[PDB]
Amino acid sequence: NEKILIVDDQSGIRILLNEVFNKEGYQTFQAANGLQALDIVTKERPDLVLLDMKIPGMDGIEILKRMKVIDENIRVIIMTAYGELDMIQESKELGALTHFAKPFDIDEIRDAVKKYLPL
């Protein structure tokens, strides 16, 4: 029943993550930019978002703020590129659950969402 939206500009990684959580029984969706994402959040209203903050043109902080407006029950976990202080701080402020840096420990990501979005 749980839905997870994976936002990432890179097919390879995005597709790998998707599988990790499909394999877990989660209804997963995928987005490559903040526009698509915003769209899916609107349409599907996922429980959690795995949001890549490094997307060209993309202001991840802004999309994070919008998701919430759209759906205030959505929880987000941001993916940093080797964690950046100010983004991590604004996100905590925005309500993000945690942050994971890439390259990631898939197992740790896994463990993390299961804990945050128990099936």
| Annotated binding-site ranges for Mg(2+) | 8-9, 52, 54
- Number of Cβ within 10 Å of residue 116's Cβ equals 13
Distance CA(89)–CA(91), nearest Å, equals 5
Q: Which of residues 73-92 bind a second copy (CB under 8 A)?
A: none
- Using alpha carbons only, give the angle 62, 66, 69 rounded to the nearest 5 degrees: 145
Distance CA(11)–CA(77), nearest Å, equals 19
Q: Is there binding between residue 19 and a second copy (CB under 8 A)?
A: yes
Query: Which residue in the set 2, 33, 94, 104 belongs to the binding site for a second copy (CB under 8 A)?
Result: 104
Query: Locate tokens 């925005």: which residue?
Result: 94
Q: How far is the CB of 65 from a second copy (least distance, A)?
A: 26
Q: Is there binding between residue 28 and a second copy (CB under 8 A)?
A: no
Query: In terms of CB distance, is 72 or 107 closer to a second copy?
Result: 107
Distance CA(2)–CA(46), nearest Å, equals 8
Q: Which residues contact 73 (CB under 8 A, 6 or more apart)?
A: 45, 47
Q: Is there binding between residue 54 and Ca ion (CB under 5 A)?
A: yes
Query: Which residue in the set 2, 13, 95, 97 belongs to the binding site for a second copy (CB under 8 A)?
Result: 13
> Which residues of the shown chain bind a second copy in the complex (CB under 8 A)?
8, 10-16, 18-19, 102-104, 106-107
> Which residues of the shown chain bind Ca ion in the complex (CB under 5 A)?
9, 52, 54
